[PDB]
Design a protein around this ligand. Structure first.
Ligand SMILES: N#C[C@@H](Cc1nc2nc(NC3CCCCC3)nc(N)n2n1)C(N)=O
Ligand SMILES: N#C[C@@H](Cc1nc2nc(NC3CCCCC3)nc(N)n2n1)C(N)=O
Ligand SMILES: [Cl-]
Ligand SMILES: [Cl-]
Ligand code: NA
Lengths: 348, 348
């Protein structure tokens, strides 16, 4: 009922601490392992405890990444500790994360059952914060590789979004291959569908574009149970990829024949009330050619998010906007001059 | 109510004729298009009509393949015709197939939802016929590439199984590249998960192995929404692949690290009392090394199907089994001496 473990502070001094927690229950299963909710005894603060198999023979990459990340739009690591668990003779890594009450997946499914779509102000807020989180991790060469609604945590009251799951995350290095089989069905970049191993951080931009399109639409834009089926849905919207485009995605694939279809114009993909700036942003995210896609920071600076930089912007609930403009040098490092757009006059 | 088209027979002279049908209704969707049931006015016979967009550029390969195939365990293409459809000025190919009332998918789910398993006699009947269809197409060098319960049709009362959807099927040629992104989630050989463009007909055997497993087990054996999750599940059963096994699947993956995990003995994967020869056949289909997997024809000859060769065997409904032993020469061509096992005494 009250459990006590010795744990290391996620960030801060490397000094072990006694940590007591109660009201423990399973909130999720998965290929990774188990997620638990619990309450810290000292503070009363809720946490989420992600428990995963530890590879006995090399240090855990997820832990390593999560210990260097510090950002308002990434879920915080409070503590970690090793333990035994279900399977015999295994050591488990336990990541003690700040609890967050909702996910983008769950909110999006709430409006879908009400035959409604998320109000656009929320879509700007959440997508803006996702892009800021990607700008941050990308500035360290870290690619998330599994951007999807389930991994986007929301606090509905504050409209703050936090990026979870660094279980697939990896620092990408040019000339060093990467497994092609990361990323979840609907959110996978074409280069990944094509089994590329030399892909870039722009795979997260594609994933992010799929999420935005999906919030606008009320359903996934590129569904399918096979790669073929996904490609067809992609080709239906984007049109047939040229050979030049294919060579940039996976050069092994340039001589394959593809379904011959004309690009279905973007304005008719989305609902009539969809804002045209949103449609423009989707088109600049969901590009075949990886380097033609907006960077996260450029995405942040897109006109769709202008309403966020309006000093007179309020949320529906009445509350002010969360922190959107406290950008660090690290965050801006890919394109410092973009600060002139991203940090509006009323915040300098 | 009555629709009249000009259609060409699936087989025989390219002689377009008037074909009238009625009692038209939708029984399916997909990336491909839509599926209809209908009734042929002349004969009263039921058909399914697969409607798909046509490429005025290049020939339809699905059509080409289905015109050539003649086999008791492959759905017969009765007619094809061109039409107007969804997109305004676009040409649709309509494949008119023999109606079959059920699928393995539906049957398996019926049982699944009731927390029961298919009786093994039915697992024998269906999997044997599946392997027979595979031996036949493979003998022409044609790989299906999308084996899964939804593509397996059956008549409940005769117990006959027929293999549908040749939309992904291709004649494979060694050393010539193929798209890796075919085959539906759960049924995909690990070489496809690794994005191999170089692969063989043995991907169908892996898939078939996944169907056998799924019917014994009551759920898919390697679920997951990412390739990584699929692979975790695979390794938990098969154990970590050796460097050599990896090289046989995709040599570009040899230098990546994999979870160090011990094989789960195969007997403890399935519920107790699961026939041991069902388990043995599974272990010879679901092999990392693609060349180590049984051929379809070897699969048919496996002891798991001995009961089918019994002169006294009957279906549960009391009728005789369908025709299981009337092999052609083409069918036996991969390994003709296997006829000794495959055609039992009472059938010669
Ligand atoms: N575990 C885990 C996720 C990240 C995650 N998921 C969370 N869910 C929550 N809360 C849930 C929101 C969904 C509704 C029930 C609790 N809180 C946190 N910190 N995380 N963090 C992963 N796969 O890495
Ligand atoms: N079209 C199509 C499927 C094959 C297919 N599916 C069928 N379903 C039926 N009948 C349904 C099966 C069970 C559900 C009711 C009707 N009949 C036929 N001939 N086919 N043929 C494909 N993806 O190519
Ligand atoms: Cl035959
Ligand atoms: Cl049945
Ligand atoms: Na090979």
């Amino acid at each position: 009922k009250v459990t006590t473990v010795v744990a290391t502070p996620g960030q801060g001094p490397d000094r072990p601490q006694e940590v007591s927690y109660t009201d423990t229950k399973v909130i999720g299963n998965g290929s990774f392992g188990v997620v638990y909710q619990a309450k810290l005894c000292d503070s009363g603060e809720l946490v989420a405890i992600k428990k995963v198999l530890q590879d006995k023979r090399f240090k855990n990459r997820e832990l390593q990444i999560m210990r260097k990340l510090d950002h308002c739009n990434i879920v915080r690591l409070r503590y970690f500790f090793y333990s035994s668990g279900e399977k015999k003779d295994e050591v488990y890594l336990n990541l003690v994360l700040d609890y967050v009450p909702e996910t983008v997946y769950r909110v999006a499914r709430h409006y879908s059952r009400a035959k409604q779509t998320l109000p656009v102000i929320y879509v700007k807020l959440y997508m803006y914060q996702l892009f800021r989180s990607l700008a941050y991790i990308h500035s360290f060469g870290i690619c998330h590789r599994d951007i999807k609604p389930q991994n986007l945590l929301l606090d509905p009251d504050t409209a703050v979004l936090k990026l979870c799951d660094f279980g697939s995350a990896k620092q990408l290095v040019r000339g060093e291959p990467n497994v092609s089989y990361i990323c979840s069905r609907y959110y996978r970049a074409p280069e990944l569908i094509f089994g590329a191993t030399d892909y870039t951080s722009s795979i997260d931009v594609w994933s992010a574009g799929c999420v935005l399109a999906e919030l606008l639409l009320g359903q996934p834009i590129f569904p399918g149970d096979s790669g073929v089926d996904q490609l067809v849905e992609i080709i239906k919207v984007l049109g047939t990829p040229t050979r030049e485009q294919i060579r940039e995605m996976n050069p092994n694939y340039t001589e394959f024949k593809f379904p011959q279809i004309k690009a279905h114009p973007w304005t008719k993909v989305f609902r009539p009330r969809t804002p045209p700036e949103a449609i423009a942003l989707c088109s600049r995210l969901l590009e075949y050619t990886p380097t033609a896609r907006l960077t996260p920071l450029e995405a942040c600076a897109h006109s769709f998010f202008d309403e966020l930089r309006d000093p007179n912007v309020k949320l529906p609930n009445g509350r002010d906007t969360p922190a959107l403009f406290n950008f660090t040098t690290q965050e801006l490092s890919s394109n410092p001059p973009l600060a002139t757009i991203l940090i509006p006059p009323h915040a300098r």
